[PDB]
Amino acid sequence: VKVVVDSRELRSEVVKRLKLLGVKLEVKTLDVGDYIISEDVAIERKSANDLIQSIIDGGLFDQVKRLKEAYSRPIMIVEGSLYGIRNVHPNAIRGAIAAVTVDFGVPIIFSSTPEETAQYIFLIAKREQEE
Amino acid sequence: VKVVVDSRELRSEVVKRLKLLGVKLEVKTLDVGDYIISEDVAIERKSANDLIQSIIDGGLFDQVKRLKEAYSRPIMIVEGSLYGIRNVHPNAIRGAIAAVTVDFGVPIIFSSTPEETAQYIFLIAKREQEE
Secondary structure: OOOEHHHHHHOOHHHHHHHOOOOOEEEEOOOOOOEEEEOOOEEEEEEHHHHHHHOOOOOOHHHHHHHHHHHHEEEEEEEEEOOOOOOOOHHHHHHHHHHHHHOOOOOOOOOOHHHHHHHHHHHHHHHHHHH | OOOEEEEEOOOOOOHHHHHOOEEEEEOOOOOOOEEEEEEEEEEEEHHHHHHHHHHHHHHHOHHHHHHHHHHHOOOEEEEEOOOOOOOOOOHHHHHHHHHHHHHHHOEEEEEHHHHHHHHHHHHHHHHHHHO
């Protein structure tokens, strides 16, 4: 399977696992998105910490808007646990998650590690290729 | 806020928290869905164990199909951790999650406890009422 990856992700552990999985990567510098699966499917990788920060600074929705305007079927993979991270009420996190997935209609898949993020990218790309 | 709840959920801890949150519940015996928010929004509550079992028995997709045919905007809340549950390869769980959220287009929100499930139902219902 072939996946386009943004230059900023090139040396990540996600890319390492993708390569071990046999994925053929094409590097590009994208204005939006981290891993492109097709003309319509693009994946944005965001750490749990960065998700919370974007909620704190009120920048999450602008980011989702930008993703949707660039791709018809964008996907956000949130990496790392969202629990145990104080300084932010659980309802703020839950509320943001519900808004993105239900209102903006952008799937939010949760990954525990960069390796798991790669496994998700891989299985989605494979399905893309098969159909 | 008003929420319709299926009779089978009446004595759950989710209902207890919903009541503490001030939600006004109307009980019904639904052929599909556990908590109805509006004519279009319905929530299906599924434990992590039951999600895995439905993957093992190949019944998950039929369930999602049934939800979509009954409601235009269904939501699935998966309750409990999906990690540490052997007898099933991680890719089987990841694959199922990707299919439901990305292909079927049905959001899959993850909750750690029945209380969190109630908090999600509450915030979604409130937004429904406000708009």
